[PDB]
Every structure is written in structure tokens, then in C-alpha cells.
């Protein structure tokens, strides 16, 4: 019973560590430019959708001188 609680100390370590590593995985890794592109890529994925509402999906060279 004394290594079983040592297992209950080793098991609750390696899961709690992975919990807090998941808590701060965003922290590591010019931070202003990187979110505006990710904001751009999601909306342009949604702008790549059809621009019709949901129930109707079954229904469906002198400027260069400036």
C-alpha cells in the first residue's frame, strides 16, 4: 500500500503537469502581426463559403496607369 500511494503521487504528477503545460502552450512563440493573419484566415475561410442563407443552400488596362 505504500508504493500504491507512490503511484498515486507519480500518476497525479504526470497528468497535472500535462494539464498545466496545456494551460500555457500558447505562451511560447511580432505578436501583433501573427493574430491579425489568423484573424484574416478564419474570416476568409468563412468568406469562402457561399454567401446565401442556410435554408437556401438547396436552391444553390488603364487603371494601371494610375
Amino acid at each position: 500500500t505504500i508504493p500504491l500511494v507512490c503511484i498515486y503521487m507519480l500518476s497525479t504528477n504526470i497528468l497535472l503537469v500535462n494539464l498545466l503545460v496545456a494551460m500555457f502552450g500558447y505562451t511560447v512563440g511580432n505578436n501583433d502581426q501573427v493574430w491579425k493573419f489568423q484573424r484574416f484566415f478564419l474570416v476568409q475561410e468563412y468568406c469562402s463559403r457561399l454567401t446565401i442563407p442556410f435554408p437556401f443552400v438547396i436552391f444553390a488596362n488603364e487603371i494601371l496607369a494610375w
Binding site: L15, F37, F40, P53
Partner: protein
Amino acid sequence: NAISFALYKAFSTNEHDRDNWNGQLKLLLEWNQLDLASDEIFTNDRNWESADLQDVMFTALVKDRPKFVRLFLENGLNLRKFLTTEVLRELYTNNFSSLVFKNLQIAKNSYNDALLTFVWKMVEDFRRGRHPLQALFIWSVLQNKKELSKVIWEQTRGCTLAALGASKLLKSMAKVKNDINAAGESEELANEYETRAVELFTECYSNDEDLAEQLLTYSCEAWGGSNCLELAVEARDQQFIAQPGVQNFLSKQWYGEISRDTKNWKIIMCLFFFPLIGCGFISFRFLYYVSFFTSPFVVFSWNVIFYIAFLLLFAYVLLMDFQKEPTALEIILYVLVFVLLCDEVRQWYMNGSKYFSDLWNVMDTLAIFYFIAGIVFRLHSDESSWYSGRVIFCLDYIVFTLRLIHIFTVSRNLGPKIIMLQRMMIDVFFFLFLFAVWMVAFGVARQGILRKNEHRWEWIFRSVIY
């Protein structure tokens, strides 16, 4: 700067090279003497014609003289008439280095793209047999002629495009790890074509903004076949797209033909009550409803309140209705899932087997595939499969809420918190995987201790988990 300055003096004072000024130019081109050639040869008191400059220009490229190619162009040289097709194939067949050409084959295979298939076709049929100035620029940007490609870029017809397309051709070859130095110099060269295209666009955006945004969606006559904006998102040019010019263009696009100065709630109070669009309550820019219901703000705002009202009639058919007959309230719940399926077969288009690699489009697709099994379990008339059809409807009610929750999770934290989220979401996807691995371990150490010790079937392959 001392040898060539001394060798030029003994050449110039032979008193026979007044007619043979062409000897003094190839001497000063064999060395690198820009300031001496610009002052003593190209100074207009001597008689030259600038038409025999063409065999000197061809050696000024392939001997890596980036300062003389600017000198011959500013002294008058029609580059769009000099670049004949036999001149261009003397570059790719003879003066294209084999190390970068063998770097291109590995760049084409492992990272295949519509731009690289155009370039790999271009190097091939030039080594086999029009917009030609847009082909010399490719020749100098593949081999990382860092000072020479800046000169050929200044002659191109549309330069908001070609600075971004070369920034893609470098960054798609900066990932080949055969020579990390050449892949490193291509990375720092593409960053100063991003920067070369940022300030060329903000100067184009400090002027008339409607004139700038027409250039973002130009057809380009198939340079790479893409526009200037689509060439930036595929190359992940974060400095170009995060500028306030383009981010204004998206917010003017996402609000659509509605102006962004109405309010936020002022559109939402018009979705419920259709007569309020016809008033001056919306300030968009004869039949304004087609401009209203085609802007993607109201399209996304419709597919949330319809999706919320989808669940409230999915909950109502699951409590009051659903006795034995698939009644009229369930047939609309049948076809609305099919409506929510008939767009996914178009999401089965433009996917490339990698749009299912976000681990949430698949949970929407496994949702509908879990719903058709409830339909199969429904029309079987036996009470063992009727109740088994009710249960895999009820578990699918959670998934059609977890899509709605994932809509609210993204759409509120869409901003600076979109990199904190969805990097954290995989990190908890990993943690619960390590939890479920541990629960299989703790199940075996519980099954291997308690009774039914040797009482075994394929019972044990499914009891140890739950």
C-alpha cells in the same frame, strides 16, 4: 578598386580606343567599377548608340553584376525588346546553376503548389524548346541574386503583384533543407519583398482606397493565376496582411454593402423585423434587401439564429413528439440535416484531404453520419431498435450543441485571442488523450485485481474501458 583603376588608365591612354570604347566597358565590367564607368564612359560627350549595349548586358547578368544592369537600364535600354526568347533560354540552360535547379525538383515534389507548378513548367519548357520581363525576374529570384532581382523588379508592369509572388517563390523554396544557407538567404530575401510590398501598398492605400482594392483582386493575366491578395495568404505573408489597409478591406467586405457606421445591434434589429430595412435605419452606401441578405455579416447572423431555432425544434421533436411515426415535425428535422449535409459535400470540395485536419470539421461531419444511423435505426418498427434509435438521437443532440458552442467559442474570441485559443485546444486534446491512456491502464489494474479473474470473452475488450 585599385587594380581596375590602374588597369583602366593604361588602357585609356592608348589613343586608339576612342572608337573602341567597347573595350573599356568590358574591362570595367570584368571588374566592378560602377562609379568609374558612369563618369568616364557613360557621360554623353563620347558618341555611342546604346544599341550595341546588348551583348554587354547579357554578360552583365550572368557574371553577377547587379550594379551595371541598373547602369545600362538608366542609360537607355529597351528591356522588353532586349529579352528575346533565345536570350532567355541562354539563361536557364547555361547560366542556371545545377544546385538550385536540383533544389527546385525537391521543392516541386514535397511542397506542391499552383505557383511552383507554373515555375517548374517554365524552367522545363525553357530547357526544352508572353510577358517576358516576368520571366527574367523569376530567373534572378530562384538563384537568390539578392541585389540583381531588386533591379529587374523595378521594371515590371505590376509591382504590387510581383513582389508578393516572388515572396511566395522564395518561401516555398526556403523550406527545402538541402542547403539551409540558401534556404536561409531565401527567407530573408522574401521578408524584404514582403516589406517591399507593404509600403508599396500603403502608399497605394494612402491615396484613394477604392482604387487600391481593385488592385487587390486583379486578374493579372495569369502571372501565377492568382490575385495579389490570394498570393499573400498562400505564402503566409504575415506582414502584408496584418497592415491596416488589408484588414480594413476585410472588415468592409465582411460587413458587405452595409456601412460599418450604423451600429452593431442596428443590423440585428432588422433581421427580426423586415420593414425596418426599408427605412433609413440602415445606411448601406431600390431593392436594398438583396444587398442586405448577401453581405456575410447577415449570412453568418442568419445561420446562428436559424441554427439555434434548429435545436429548439430538435428538442421539441425529442420530448413531445417521436412516439412511433416519423411525423411532420421530424420530416423537417430530416431534411434540415440533409440541408446541413448538402453543403458538406461542397465542403467535401475545396478540401484536398486537409480541411478535415482541424479536428472540428470532422466532428461536424461525424455528427451527420451519426444522425443517419439514427434514421436507419428509426424505421425498423421493433422496440429494441426504436429505443436504440432514440438514444443515438439524444447523443447527437450534444454534438449539435457542441457545434453551436464552438461557434460561440470562436466568434467571441476571434481577435488577438485566436492564437491563444486553437493552440490551447490541441493542448487539451493531447491531455485528455493522456488521460484516456491512463484510464485504460487503471482499468486493467482494476480488472486484473477484482473478480471475473479468469471469466473471459470479448466482454473484456469492451468492459475495461468504461
